[PDB]
Amino acid sequence: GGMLTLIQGKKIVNHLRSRLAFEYNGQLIKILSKNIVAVGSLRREEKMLNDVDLLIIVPEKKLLKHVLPNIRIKGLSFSVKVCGERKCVLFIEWEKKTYQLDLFTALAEEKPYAIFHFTGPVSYLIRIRAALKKKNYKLNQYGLFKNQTLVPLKITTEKELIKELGFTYRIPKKRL
Amino acid sequence: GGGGMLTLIQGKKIVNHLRSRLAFEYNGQLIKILSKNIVAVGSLRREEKMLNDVDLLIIVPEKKLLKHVLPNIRIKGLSFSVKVCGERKCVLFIEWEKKTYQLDLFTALAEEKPYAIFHFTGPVSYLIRIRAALKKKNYKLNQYGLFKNQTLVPLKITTEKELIKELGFTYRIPKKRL
DNA sequence: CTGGATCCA
DNA sequence: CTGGATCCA
DNA sequence: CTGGATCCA
DNA sequence: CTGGATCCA
Ligand SMILES: Nc1nc2c(ncn2[C@H]2C[C@H](O)[C@@H](CO[P@](=O)([SeH])OP(=O)(O)OP(=O)(O)O)O2)c(=O)[nH]1
Ligand SMILES: Nc1nc2c(ncn2[C@H]2C[C@H](O)[C@@H](CO[P@](=O)([SeH])OP(=O)(O)OP(=O)(O)O)O2)c(=O)[nH]1
Ligand SMILES: [Mn+2]
Ligand SMILES: [Mn+2]
């Protein structure tokens, strides 16, 4: 995995938006643009990137075993380092260089929690999570939990989630 | 794979050799591990004819020692290299009588002993049936204890035999478990 | 069935 | 802070 | 490698 | 309707 600039990251994401699909029992299902979310240091607009992180929103639980393991990227040369249902790491060829692409999956119901988790940075996530831990809550990429039971927040966006958790909303680049 | 297959008796002779030769460094103090706190487990305890490795469970008196026992293990006089080594699992490739074998070391705390022995004895298929049955009654059995809702259920038991009976199963000697 | 060592995310 | 993939145990 | 019950095309 | 997939303790 080589080092990328922000500008290169954005250009790679633009190329992938239209070209991600997966094979579901011998049928090629296209992944929709609205279900593809740039996360990690790219969403945070860091000028240096070690990789490109994309979150894929999966409409149904039964598709989890198919999406990342049978991933297709039309016309692009890549090799797969590790791949399960929730994280898949590809090495993509881009013009005499090799870049690390990380793909992650969230179910529709996990969406804002996954976006929050994968946006980071880690330092920010630790503060937030410790603050909720003190109130006996547990936050991860799948939900908010109290006593190992899911807390039913009824929210769509990452912004709604953050307000509902009782924290000051900050744009991805201003989180630290 | 790491090591060659051994006969049962080869495995036992290796265990007999190692019983009086395991030690660890506790801040430069070299402490011998007691034979009483070493239990042969895995296919050796089940008395299978051929073994793919040797599994030993080391019983550790106190929690503070877990960061020292396996990470600073010593087998004086024996030639070996390390595959992986943490506090709960250390795997070694040992030289015994001019062939290379895999030696698995595991640690259990004193309170965990009967659960650990049960875990590491196997066989795997047997353990899965036992655990599935307890899972259906909302328990979780592992090498550290029996749990109900991520909370330790303190059984008044000491040995593996007592544990297997208290869990509501028919006790079978290691070699009869399938 | 359940979890460890490693190296990430 | 909290969890995933790999290859085991 | 739960394994019988229950769901759903 | 029933059989393969998924549920659940
Ligand atoms: N809770 C938690 N989340 C973590 C962690 N590491 C990465 N993540 C999540 C948040 C990160 O923004 C995202 C991608 O991680 P990674 O690629 Se290692 O770092 P990222 O912030 O993108 O910067 P870069 O890729 O190093 O440029 O995954 C972590 O340790 N704990
Ligand atoms: N719960 C559970 N326990 C497992 C598992 N694999 C190994 N173990 C435990 C039980 C085994 O008897 C023990 C040693 O494993 P391993 O060395 Se892979 O098999 P073992 O029975 O010694 O046969 P051999 O080493 O192949 O001769 O560790 C497992 O999948 N689940
Ligand atoms: Mn990244
Ligand atoms: Mn073994």
All domains of chain A in start order, with CATH: 4-107 (3.30.460.10), 109-174 (3.30.210.10)
Give me B62's structure tokens.
């106190």
Resolution, in Å, please?
A: 2.3
- Ligand 2 atom closest to residue B50's alpha carbon, by position in its atom list: 27
Residues 6+ apart with CB under 8 A from B42: B51, B53, B54, B55, B104, B120, B121, B122
Breaks in chain A after residues, C-to-N cutoff 2.5 Å: none
**CA of residue B55 to ligand 4 center, whole Å:** 5
Does B27 count as an annotated binding residue? no
Phi then psi dihedrals of residue B114, to 5 deg: -65, -30
The two three-digit tokens of residue A76, written as one number: 């692009």
Q: Which helix (H) or strand (E) holds A160?
A: helix A158-165
DSSP code, position B152: B
Q: What are phi and psi of A4, to 5 degrees?
A: -120, 155
Instruction: Name residue B141's beta-bridge partners.
Output: B146
Q: Among A152, A155, A126, A159, which Cα is nearest to A140's?
A: A126
Continuous H helices in chain B: 8-18, 42-45, 113-121, 124-135, 160-166
Ligand 1 mean position to A116 CA, how many Å? 11
Q: Is A102 annotated as a binding residue?
A: yes
Contact B107, B66 (CB under 8 A): yes
> What are the respective helix, strand and coil percentages of chain B, to the nearest 5?
30, 30, 35
DSSP calls for A57-105: EES-GGGHHHHTTTEEETT--EEEEEE-SSEEEEEEEETTEEEEEEEEE
Nearest CA to ligand 2 atom 7: B124
How many helices and strands, by DSSP H and E, does chain B display? 5, 12
Report the C-alpha gap between B128 and B134 in whole angstroms: 10
The phi-psi region of residue A69 (left if phi > 0; otherwise alpha if psi is between -120 and 50; otherwise beta) is alpha
A148 sits within 7 Å of strand F by its CB: no
